[PDB]
Write a protein that binds this ligand. Sequence first.
Ligand SMILES: CC(C)c1cnn2c(Nc3ccc(S(=O)(=O)N(C)C)cc3)cc(N[C@H]3CC[C@H](N)CC3)nc12
Length: 286
Amino acid sequence: MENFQKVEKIGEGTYGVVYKARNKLTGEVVALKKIRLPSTAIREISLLKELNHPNIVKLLDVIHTENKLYLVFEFLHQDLKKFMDASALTGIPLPLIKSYLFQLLQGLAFCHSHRVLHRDLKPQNLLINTEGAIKLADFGLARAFGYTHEVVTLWYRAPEILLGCKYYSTAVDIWSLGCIFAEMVTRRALFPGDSEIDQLFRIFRTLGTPDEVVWPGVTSMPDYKPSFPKWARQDFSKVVPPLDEDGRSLLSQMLHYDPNKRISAKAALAHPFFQDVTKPVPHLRL
Ligand SMILES: CC(C)c1cnn2c(Nc3ccc(S(=O)(=O)N(C)C)cc3)cc(N[C@H]3CC[C@H](N)CC3)nc12
């Protein structure tokens, strides 16, 4: 730590608080995550150091000291939520939404081919820079270990996790990214639940209550109950206007109940939604 000069708090997570920091030594500006009070987490964390992609925030180093842990990261100036707020009156132009979705999928297709899942994608875990890039952030702090008790959002949790699946797949990240995708198009959260059952029931009211017809094995799931009310599905023509036909088709596949039929990032890269994909510069104001 004596290597670093704090600059400001940029964030706080379940895990640690995040400082903008400068190398007392090199002048290099970095982001410094502190995690408070072991062994396989170390190996885990260190396995991330290797997981480098243009669309994953780069983990520069791991300092382990006096039982405090610190991860030194590349620093980005803004997150997708703040950018999303700054766009609310007009919303993010479609070619920019498409570019972001496209880069995150490439991010995820890398993750996934290497067996790493993010587990917690959400607008504030996504960071942007002035050159049109969006990066998955704080990534694989999932199979790490466990200070504010500030509630985590459920809004992007995949239904298999809510139904108590222990062993869930890479498909949970796609569900999450599709939640974010629809949110970018609409300027409102897709499934803004405020408890687990409420989060479940909001998915049900838009997507239909899942049964064995749409999701083989649904009813044998840990947290499934037959007494779940039976909601009818809606068309996404009503869920994400005015997303075009390609976009609605893509979102649909990213929001399949059955994780195993849910589109993979790889397949998602090949979807005609991305036929005309470009990389627009965003206006940022820092
Ligand atoms: C530790 C890594 C992954 C990193 C790199 N940059 N950065 C930032 N930068 C940042 C700066 C300003 C803003 S900003 O001006 O929009 N704004 C103030 C909102 C938002 C984010 C913020 C940040 N913090 C959150 C902490 C919680 C974690 N789950 C995701 C990362 N982390 C980072």
